[PDB]
Amino acid sequence: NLFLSTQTIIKEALRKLGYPGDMYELMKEPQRMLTVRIPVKMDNGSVKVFTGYRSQHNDAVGPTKGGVRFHPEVNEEKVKALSIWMTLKCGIANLPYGGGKGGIICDPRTMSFGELERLSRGYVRAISQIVGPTKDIPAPDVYTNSQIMAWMMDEYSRLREFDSPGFITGKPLVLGGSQGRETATAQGVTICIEEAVKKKGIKLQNARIIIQGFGNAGSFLAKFMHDAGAKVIGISDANGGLYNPDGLDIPYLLDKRDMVTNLFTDVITNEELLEKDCDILVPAAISNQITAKNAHNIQASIVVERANGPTTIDATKILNERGVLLVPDILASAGGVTVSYFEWVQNNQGYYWSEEEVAEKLRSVMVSSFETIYQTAATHKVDMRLAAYMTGIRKSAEASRFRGWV
């Protein structure tokens, strides 16, 4: 279903790029799909056999790259689909990678640390033949973290008889992790505002911006925008939104939170906060915030998605026709995958970059990805979302051609 929805998107994107159908037949399923059974000694002395997966979508451009999930709903179809999505993000950030993804069907919340360790190592031993720094490079995802990565890195290094940091990203700093990982995703959101705002004549300092969500993501964009000399006209959280044409007191609002709306009167609803006057609207979380109902009322010259599919297909169509600049999530949120790439480059070198160097390299990537997608949207007269998808599978498509596969 997700799988089928993901298939249709690749078909359309390839169709628009000018490819005949054989390229779709190549791209529509992974090159390789591995299913494994992994026995694990449970604390209570039993043995439990877990089912795991690793999908390697297409390696024409380079080795595959993507997270491993530990979750009871993990399944084969989903893992294939998320691997295809990873290909798109690799194309977007122009990474020398194809997409990969894995998962294990388990519930880490009812498991001890030891059991999780043992399952992590069993996963690495089950898939080692098809995975490695030149082949397929995993990462954190749902219910996995830098610890799980450390354990998988250790197991892999033992199988091989040499330290292999480059096998897997999201590692602890002392195991060859990258600086700049914690705010990588939000930093690229900000760089996408800076480049969208140039296209629409506004100067950043004069920009009036509305931001939904005031957790980690929202507040980072908040402070960045305030510190840039712009006016965060509007904020929002679970409770509702604050609007104020002069610019909100972000230093004060940051100083008390968890998050903040509750301690104020004149709290409007997230619905009306969306239709307010601003240059830039950034919705967080929450699918289908902007729909066919809302779309005509959105006042912003620029919408920057910061998650999770907040604009419907119909709404995206409307805003495109109405000439608003929609920066999609798949481009705006690509910093995460970018610094995970950078961690792997650093492991290739055995040389580690400072926070600042990581940030400079990040922005050059984001700025270039923005421009390619825009110039693509212009030259094919499509929205930047379809344009993002085209620039997503395009690399793999051209790579596969060049290599004599289709």
Active site (catalytic) residues: 101
Amino acid at the residue 107: D
Contact 151, 182 (CB under 8 A): no
Contact in structure between 396 and 218 (CB atoms under 8 Å): no
Find the shortest distance in angstroms from Cβ 82 to a second copy.
16
Q: Which is nearer to a second copy, 136 or 305 (CB)?
A: 136
State yes or no: 65 annotated in a binding site.
Answer: yes
Q: Calculate the alpha carbon distances from 341 to 68, 109, 150, 260 in Å.
A: 16, 29, 17, 35
Shorter beta-carbon distance to a second copy: residue 11 or 200: 11
Least Cβ distance, residue 277 to a second copy (angstroms): 39
Q: Supply the minimum distance, in Å, between the C-beta of residue 107 and a second copy.
A: 17
Dihedral sign, Cα of residue 388, residue 391, residue 394, residue 395: negative
User: Is 395 annotated for ligand binding?
Assistant: no
Q: Does the annotation place 120 within a ligand binding site?
A: no
Q: How far is the CB of 62 from a second copy (least distance, A)?
A: 5
* Closer to a second copy by Cβ: residue 294 or 346: 346
Number of other residues whose CB lies within 10 A of the CB of residue 111: 19
Smallest separation (angstroms) from a second copy to the CB of 133: 9
CA dist 342 and 169 (Å) reads 9
Name the residue nearer to a second copy (CB basis): 62 or 309: 62
CA 71 to chain centroid? 19
Q: Give the nearest distance from C-beta 166 to a second copy in angstroms.
A: 9
**Strands 280-282, 302-304: pairing kind:** parallel
* C-alpha–C-alpha distance, residues 18 and 335, integer Å: 29
Dist CA 61 CA 50 (whole Å): 32
| Beta carbon nearer to a second copy, 135 or 380 | 135
**Residues near a second copy, by CB under 8 A:** 22, 25-26, 29-37, 39, 46-49, 51, 59-63, 96, 117, 125-126, 128-130, 132, 134-135, 147, 150-151, 153-154, 158-159, 161-165, 172, 174-176, 344-345, 348-352, 354, 364, 395, 398-399, 402-406
Residues 6 or more apart in contact with residue 52 via CB below 8 angstroms: 35, 36, 37, 38, 102, 103, 104, 105, 123, 126, 127
Comparison of 330 and 365: residue with beta carbon closer to a second copy = 365
- Shortest CB 115 distance to a second copy, Å: 13
Q: Which is nearer to a second copy, 60 or 221 (CB)?
A: 60
- Of 286, 315, 339, give the one whose Cα is nearest residue 89: 339
* Residues annotated in a binding site for substrate: 65, 89, 340
* Residues annotated in a binding site: 65, 89, 185, 216, 340
* Residues annotated in a binding site for NAD(+): 185, 216
